[PDB]
Amino acid sequence: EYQNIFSQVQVRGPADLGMTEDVNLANRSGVGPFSTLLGWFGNAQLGPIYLGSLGVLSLFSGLMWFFTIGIWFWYQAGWNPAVFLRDLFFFSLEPPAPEYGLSFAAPLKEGGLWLIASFFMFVAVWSWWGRTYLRAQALGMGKHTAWAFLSAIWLWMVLGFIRPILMGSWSEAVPYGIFSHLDWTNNFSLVHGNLFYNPFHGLSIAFLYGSALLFAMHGATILAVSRFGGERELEQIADRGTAAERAALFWRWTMGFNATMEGIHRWAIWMAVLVTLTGGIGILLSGTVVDNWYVWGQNHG
């Protein structure tokens, strides 16, 4: 009994340069190498990639964010490479102290460098968002990827920008460090009277859970009907096959209702986007509207 988790045989042909539509081919790179390792699990072809104005801006801006944090880590490590690797997880680029409020006047060593790194990150993510929209437009596809990415950006924006502004200081924002961003998360809950009493945190968990539930169900289902070409989802949408019928009936007979080949992808996009949508609201309301979720929960108001 073959399970179809790994391919038994790889076949290779000419590098695929992709569909043209309204894409400016001048901005496409050449193909990269074929990976036999990747080819056991999915596609072997690396590249081409598309890199126009927004791509270069996003990539340079992203590297400047990453390097800015790195330079601070080196400074904290006293330029010793042994201390750098020893204390990597413990280094932290902290935002400005509460004193400085929402001013850009803080010195480099006490939150100025946090603001510079944050500026670079802000540009990197937003230009990357523009790129997800425009790459879809060039191919005549719907903007589903750009709208789904906006749900992730919402929670990020709330954590680093919108909530700090509404609280009146950058000190409320997340520090750039491995262990420090974990300590911040733990602290945020203690200070707001335990996020388990935040009903939006409860919903966010339900969707995070539900995303693993749904991708386990959907992935297992498509592998179970791959013996009838089930993973060819677009043609199964245009012209329902026995794959789509058996997939539906498995679930109808198990739990009393079922999806369509198109409809399961609507369940999928919404289960995932509701994670960061509900999450962002839960965080936005914490400290701005609700000081203590235990206390709020005792009144339900």
Partner: protein, 281 residues
């Protein structure tokens, strides 16, 4: 009633136990022997939770809580009122979950499809059995198990976590979280991609899988492909739950101190342990 295409699939056979005895449907629901076992275990479990509500003196669903035996009882049986009901409910829950999986196997056999779905569900059962059976037994008391109550089970999560300091520092917990976050990223992208191809700009033809591969190559220089993304989703979500089970089986057994202190293995490696500067010197 039947889906328009359903009748041709409703043939006899595929049962694991009892031949044609339970080989029927009730509305959309397939029964089989494990349909009967599921109903029996679920009905018995619900009655025992009701009987627990009586002894506790509340019918409010947000207050009902069935607690395991106190630590003093160890791995022994306990009186119904103080942990026995929890023990019997836990056997009923295990029976209902395993029966549900084996019913999925019978449905797989009748439809001539692979067994990936019940195999995937078995990982969720493992996680449940880690918390209520494997960890308690290795620690020597049922009382380390979680209570069956909407809010009291969250109280248990909070108390169990903070027993070891900030539970963020459990390294298996870090890996589990990474798989949960990555799974949600991948599910959003997969749903978005297929819908963006099936529902293009107004008035344009349906896009092809070639457009889907092209979109991702343009965006990130790599497309895993249509088979690949379903393999990936299955692996991310099962990996999340595997590492979840692992992060709890090692907690209170091989490691029972603060998780933050575990990371001193790295800091105290001889070659950089004593060098001045940084955070840890």
């Amino acid at each position: 009633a039947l889906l328009s295409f359903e009748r041709k699939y409703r043939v006899p056979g595929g049962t694991l136990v009892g031949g044609n005895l339970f080989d029927f449907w009730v509305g959309p629901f397939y029964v089989g022997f494990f349909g009967v076992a599921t109903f029996f275990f679920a009905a018995l479990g619900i009655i025992l939770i009701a009987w627990s509500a009586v002894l506790q003196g509340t019918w409010n669903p947000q207050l009902i809580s069935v607690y395991p035996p106190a630590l003093e009882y160890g791995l022994g049986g306990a009186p119904l009122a103080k942990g026995g009901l929890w023990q019997i409910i836990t056997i009923c829950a295990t029976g209902a979950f395993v029966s549900w999986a084996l019913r999925e196997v019978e449905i797989c056999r009748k439809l001539g499809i692979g067994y990936h779905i019940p195999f995937a569900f078995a990982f969720a059962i493992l996680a449940y059995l880690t918390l209520v059976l494997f960890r308690p037994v290795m620690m020597g008391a049922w009382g380390y198990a979680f209570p069956y109550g909407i809010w009291t089970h969250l109280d248990w999560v909070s108390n169990t976590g903070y027993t070891y300091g900030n539970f963020h520092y459990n390294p298996a917990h870090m890996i589990a979280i990474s798989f949960f976050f990555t799974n949600a990223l991948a599910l959003a992208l997969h749903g978005a991609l297929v819908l963006s191809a099936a529902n293009p700009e107004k008035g344009k033809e349906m896009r092809t899988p070639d457009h889907e591969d092209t979109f991702f190559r343009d965006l990130v220089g790599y497309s895993i492909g249509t088979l690949g993304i379903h393999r990936l989703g299955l692996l991310l979500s099962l990996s999340a739950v595997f590492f979840s089970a692992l992060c709890m089986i090692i907690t209170g057994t091989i490691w029972f101190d603060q998780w933050v202190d575990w990371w001193q293995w790295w800091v105290k490696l001889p070659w950089w342990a004593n060098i001045p500067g940084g955070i840890n010197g």
